[model samples]
Target: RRRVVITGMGMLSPLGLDVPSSWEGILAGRSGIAPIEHMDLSAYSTRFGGSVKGFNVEEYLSAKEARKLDLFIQYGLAASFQAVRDSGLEVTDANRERIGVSMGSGIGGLTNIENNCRSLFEQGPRRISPFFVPGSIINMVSGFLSIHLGLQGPNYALTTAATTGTHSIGMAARNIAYGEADVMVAGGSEMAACGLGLGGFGAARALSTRNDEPTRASRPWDRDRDGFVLSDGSGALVLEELEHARARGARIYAELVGFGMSGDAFHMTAPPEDGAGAARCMKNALRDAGLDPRQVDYINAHGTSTPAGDIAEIAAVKSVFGEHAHALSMSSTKSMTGHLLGAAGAVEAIFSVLALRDQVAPPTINLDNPDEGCDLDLVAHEAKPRKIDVALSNSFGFGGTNGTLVFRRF
Candidate 1:
């Protein structure tokens, strides 16, 4: 089997529009969560979220070209373009067929679906544009990128709730390993901070209602955390076979050594109190990577700030790492990015690679007071410079699906 390496990364988070800026914001312990201004939120309980700001679509696609697609797809394309450019992989005829794309979203085009539903209710079905279906589908991110970039290899999207990004990137790496493609542009994108999204999560009681302090709302592992804040963004990476990347002299960010997935089969929206499934997932990833628990220096946790989730992940880490749990620094970048849902895994995976590259662990901010049993080094409020040779990122979705990726410093 071939080894996969991350040659480039691109992201549009609440923190910033690209990798460098977002990483800088993360290291500075800045919060990108704020009052949601793109739509009216007076009717909703969760009035604020992590919204991507100042993203100009015209920079990646023409205004005319972007008009028909949904915001998630546009964000995906922009991030993919950035990654491709950063990888410096020329899409010539010889390599075009060997390059593919795998990107996805948890809730694809919720805003578009809401607007079209309204149009259908008031103006009738005839008023809905033909682009409605294509613009809003979960797989269009991969479809549109393939068409735009002339990539002919395996192109698909995996929609597994919050695990969408991790699953997509993991499958992309498998494709490269199995001789299906030499390179894969993979990740996830999302823009679900609309009225329907907000109201739906609120109804499920899955959103934080700390409207007074938006920046401090996503306080993962904090004793007072109520729920995870909704967020919108896209994250992408250019993954290539190690030899292929070496042949091109591509700049390697990290080596993707392992990918593992599991299903809790216990609940639809929540993990077990003991986090048994998540523990198994992490153990599987370590075994796949041929690594011992002590070798992992940092973890980008799926600590979504929800009371149950934060504690469950802590339990999982303890169960998997045991005595070494106290030695590793685990942090939730979501404490700053505010839970990107499908995009969170990929965004955090990039952060893990950066952690390995810079030998620093990003912070879990707003964690002024950690909950009981959340005793590991959470990196608290400020980024911690450390010896990070191996980093892991975890993502668990609504359906009890869990995914983990392990990266080693290249």
Candidate 2:
């Protein structure tokens, strides 16, 4: 089998605009969750989200070109540009054809859709922008990247709710391993912190209402935690065949040893109380990697800070790891970054790789009072230094979709 490895990575997260700054924020245990400044929240009980701040479109694209795309596509392009540059992969006449992009969004162009709909109802159909169709589509992120970067190989975009990013990466890796592409940029992005996005989630009671204390809103595993916090951002990774990466002397962040996905066959929003599907997902990844459960040193959990989600993930972890459960570190970075929805898996996957590279486990901030099932060493409050050779990142989405990626130090 052809092996796949991550050669580069980039991100536009609420914590930071790039990989180094974001990782630094995570290590410092910073809370990116804050009051909703991007939009008005007077009509909503949940008044906060993890909004990406201080982003400049001119940094990656021209002012005119930027106007043609949606915020999610802009952020995704910015991340992909950084990842390609960091990898030192020259997309020239030689390799451009063999490179591809696999990027996606869970609720793409929600802001665009909302704005267009309001214009249609209030003003007139003629007021609608011509760029609506291309700009507001879910696959536009991947389409934009492919056109901008000259990639011609397999291009895909997953909209699997929270599993979008991890699923995209897994699919990209398979594209290379199956001889469809030599290199692929894979990840997910979202800009759903708008009126309709937040209002819909709020209506569903899927958002935390700690209005007075936004920083503490996303307290995953904490007894007082109520729900997950909505966030917006993008994360991209450069995945290449092992031989191709080695031939160019690229810096290998980690090897993509295994990728597993499963469906819950349960509720649309809530995971099964027992977390049986989640456990099977992790087990499948471990089996794919041909490793024992004890070999995993760290886990970036799908602990979305919701009461049910936090406990369900814990149950799943325990069920999968068994005796090794207490021996490893499992932390929810969502406690700091909030839940990025589709972008969550990619950002957390980057954090997992960084944990392996830096030999430090990031913390689950605001986890003051742990819940019953979450009894593992969560590395709460502060980052901890530890040697981690193998790490797993779990992403569970709405509709009971689950994805797990196992990364090993190369």
Candidate 3:
């Protein structure tokens, strides 16, 4: 198998427009969650969410071109461009076919769908834009990026709810390992904080209702936590074969040592109380890496601040690592970034790589008080500097899908 390495990463979260800024926000223990000011939230139960601020599509696309696509595609393209630039990977005619893209969203273009539906019913079907179908579909991120960048290799998007990003990245690495491509652009993007997005999650009671204290709403492992906060963002990474990266003199961030996935098969949106499926996911990742549990020093947890999910992830860690779990520092960046859904895994994976690069774990902010069973060192409210050689990022989505990635210091 070809060794895969992360050469570059790009991100746009509620925290910031790129990786460094967002990581600064994370390490500073700042919360990006706030009121959703773009839309009227009077009819919704949850009014606060993590909304991307000050994102200018003109930076990456012409205004006319940007207008035809949805915000999710724009976000994905912007992030992917940043990643490709950061990687210093020039798309020459000779190498274009050796490069590809794998990106997606959990609920692609919800804002577009909602608007088109309204236009169909209120304004009539003739009012719909010609770009409606192409704009809102999940594959357009990869499709548009491939066409724009002239990447002719494997180009596709995977939709597995929150696990979408993890799967996209994992499979991109697999493509390289299987001799499919030398370089692959991969990750996830999402901008689902529209009317239908908020309404759907709100109806499911999956969002926190701490409207008054928006910044503190996403309190993972906290005793007063209600639910995860919705967020909008995108994360993209440039993955390359290790030798290919070295030959190009591309700076290496971390080596992707392992990837694993699992299915709970127990519920539509909830993990079992024992977290058996999540435990299996972690164990599978460890097996793939051929590393012992104690070799892991930090974990970027999928702790979404949900009442049940928070405790279950902790249980899963305990079950998988046993006594060594106490020695590991696990924190949820979701506590600060809110839950970006599909983009969560990709962004968290970038954070894990940065954690390895800097040897500091990002804090889980707003953990004023930990719940009874949430006893692992959650790195609460302050970044913890440690000798982190191996890091794991976890992402679990609705429909029992789970994915884990293992990164080792390069």
Candidate 4:
């Protein structure tokens, strides 16, 4: 297998825009959930969501450029630009051929789709924008990044709901390791904090209706937890081959030790009671890292705060971690940031790097009262300082799709 390392990272979210601020907010146990203010959400059942504040589009692209792209694509471009610059790599003609990008979104251009659909109902199908089709596809975001940077490496986007973010990073790492690319820009983004996104989730009874208390609405692993809150954001990383990063004296963040993906083959919208597929993903990730499950010091869980989802994930952890399960300090940052849905894996990956960097684990906030099956020490209420050498992030999506990624600090 080829060696892979993360040399650069960037993000735009309700918590913060840059790495240092986001990490600080995560450790401080801050909540980004709030009432939606970007547009008129009066008609929707859920009026709150996690939205980026004061994100002026011109800051990332020109006025002309902004007119053609949807909100998610703009977020992806901005985050990717930040990652590449943070990596500080010189991708000249010599190795430009080997540079690529893997960017993904669970529901691509949803806002665009929503707006176009509304127009059809109001005026006619002829009123729909000509760019609606391209704007509604998941590949457009990745394609935009590829064009923006002149990238010639593997350019593809995977859409597996919450699993999309992790899959993008994992696939990009494999491309670099296989000598298919020298460096790859990989991550995920979403812009579903608006009417349709929140309404759709509300219709599914998947969003917290504690709309009165926006900040505390998301309570993962808590007995009072009702549903996951809607969140929108983007995260990106610049992956460089071990030798490639070292040759240029790049700043190394973490090593990509293992990547594991699995399928539940059980349900379309919910995890199995046994969490069998999730257990397989966890064990496979540990095995891929060539280490025991005990080596995992902290886990960033896909605990979306839903009663069934949270319990099933804990069962999966118990099945995999076994003896060390009690000793591990696992958490679901969704308690603070709500759930980023498709963009969750990338955001969670950033949390894993922060855990390794500061030797501290983020807490599962709002965990006031634990449920029957969730007996683990869920790093409740506040963050804790713990030495984390090997860390993992797990993302289990709708339709029983799962992906787990392990990172090691040097």
Candidate 5:
């Protein structure tokens, strides 16, 4: 199997527009959660969300270019563009065919769906915009980015709900493993900041209602955590084969060592109580990398700040890693960025890479009152400097979907 490596990273998160700012904010334990500003949420129950600020669609694309896309695709394209720029690669005449894109969106184009549905109800079927179908589908984001970037090798969107981000990365690695492509773009995007986004998650009783204190809302592993927080953002990276990247003098972030995936079949909304599936997924990834559980220094947990889910995930760690889990200092970046749903894994993967690259683990902030079962050395409040040689980012989503990706710095 060919070795996969990450060449570049990009982010369009609520914390900041790009990776540097996002990493700084995340390490500083900054909260990107705020009241909805993009749309009019006059009477919405849930208010606080990690809304992307000052994002100009035209900044990433022209009015003519962006008019057809929904906010989800816009975010994906913007992040991917920055990632390609960050990779310092020219997908021009020489390398366009070797480059590919694998992006995912959990909830694709809610704004488009709402608008198009409203048009049909209020006016007529013919009143719906021609871009409605293309704007709202998950594949369209990757499709548009491919056209814009001139990537011709492969373009796909992996959909796995909250696990979407990790799934995309894992699949991208598989693509490289089998020599599918030389360079692959993979990550997650989401735009659940609008009314439809809020109402849907809120109705499902999945969003945190800490409207009074936005920053402290997403308290993962805390006894007070009611549910996860809704967040909007996009994250992507440029993955290149080790030899191809080194030959082109590309700066590598981390070696893509292993990828893991599983399903609970336990429930749609909640993970299996035993956490056996989650534990096995982590262990499988470790085994894939020919690593022992003890070798893992840190984990960017899929801790979405939910009540039962937090306890279950921790329990799984105990079941699999045992004593080594004791030494692992895991933190949930979702505590700061809020639960980005689909994009959680990608950004957390970036966070994990940063933890390995910068030797600084981000915080799980708002652990004012930690639960007994949530007993892990969760780096809290502030960022801590630590040596992280190997790290894994976990992302599990609805429908019992799960994904885990491991990275070790060179």
Candidate 6:
């Protein structure tokens, strides 16, 4: 099997518009969670979200062309474009067939859906625009990129709740490993912090109602954390076969050594209290990489600031890593970025790579007091410089779906 490596990355996140800015925000203990500004949150208990600000669609798409796409699609396209350009890989006619895209959106274009539904009800059936279907679909992000960029190989979207980005990246890596393609663009996008999106999670009581303190809302592993803050953004990367990338003199960021996934089969929205499923998922990824638990020095935790989730994930890490868990530094970047839903996995993955590159672990802010069953070296409050060789990023989503990726310094 061929080795897969990341050559470039891009981010459209609540933290910032690009990778460097987002990483800077993470290391500086800055919080992107703030009051929802685009819509009226008067009716909802949770009024704050990790909203992306100052994003210009015309930077990547024409005004006329941007109008045809949903915001989520626009985010995906912009991120993917940055990734491809960063990679310096020219998708010419000769190599177009060997290049593919595998991007996913957990809740694709929810804002569009809500508005279109209103139009159909209040205005009329004929009032719905033809672009509604194309703009609102989950898979159209990948389709739109393939058409615009002339990528003809294995274009697809893999949606699995918030794990969509992790799974999409894993699947794209497998495609390259099996000689199906030489290069692939994979990630996830989400722009679902609108009325229906927030209301749905709000109805479930899954969002933090700390409207008074938005920065302190997403406090992962903290006793005061009530629930996760909603967020909107996208993340993407350019992955290539190691030899192919080397031949082209592409600057490799890190080698994707392991990818694993599992289903809880236990609940629709909650992971098991013991976290055995998530533990097994991490173990599987390590086994795939031929690595021991002690090899990993850092973990980008899937800590969403939820009450049960923070403890469950810690239990999983302890179970998998044992005494090594105490030595390894693990932190939740979500403490600063809120939760990006589908795009969380990809963004965290890029952070993991950056951690290896910079030898620094991002911090879990707002963790002044730790909760029971969540005591670990969380690298809290401030960034910590350390020797990091191998790092792992975990992503678990609703429906009990979990994905883990292992990255090694190049």
Candidates' TM-scores? 0.99, 0.99, 0.99, 0.97, 0.98, 0.99
- lDDT for 301 in candidate 5 is 93
How does model 1 score by TM-score? 0.99
lDDT of 5 by residue, 245-302 (tens): 9998999999989998888889889787778779888988998998998899999999
Where does model 4 exceed 4 Å of error? none
Model 2, 1-410: lDDT tens digits are: 68999999999988999999999999999999889876677999999989889999899999988887889988888888988998998888898889999998899998888888999999999989999999889888788888888888888899999999999998898899898999999999999988888899999999999999999999989999999999999999999999999999998999999989999999999888889999999999999888889999999999898878789888888888888899899999998899998889989889999999999999999999898877899999999999899999999998999999999999
Model 2 ranges with Cα > 4 A deviation: none
Q: Is candidate 3 or candidate 6 better by lDDT?
A: 3
1-410: candidate 6 lDDT, tens digit per residue: 99999999999988899999999999999999888888888999998999889999999988988898889999999889989989999989899999999999888988888888999999899989799998889888889899989999999998888798999999999999999999999999999888889999999999999999999999999999999988988899999999999999999999999998888888898889889889999999999888999999999999999988899899999999999999999999999998888899989999999999999999999999999877789998999999999999999999999999999997
- Taken over the whole model, the C-alpha lDDT of each candidate is 0.93, 0.91, 0.93, 0.87, 0.87, 0.92
**Candidates' RMSD to native:** 0.7, 0.9, 0.7, 1.3, 1.1, 0.8
Stretch of 10 with least lDDT, candidate 4: 133-142
Please identify model 3 stretches exceeding 4 Å from their true place: none
Model 4 over residues 307-372: C-alpha lDDT tens digits? 788888999999998989999889999888878877889989988987998899899888888889
Model 3's C-alpha root-mean-square deviation from the true structure amounts to 0.7
lDDT of 1: 0.93
Q: What does the lDDT come to for candidate 4?
A: 0.87
Candidate 3: tens digits of C-alpha lDDT, residues 179-250: 999999999999998888988999899999999899999999999999999999999999999999999899
- The ten-residue window of minimal lDDT in model 2 covers 33-42
The per-candidate count of clashes, in order, stands at 0, 0, 0, 0, 0, 0
Candidate 1, residues 108-161, lDDT tens digits: the string is 999889999999999999989789999899999999999988999998999998
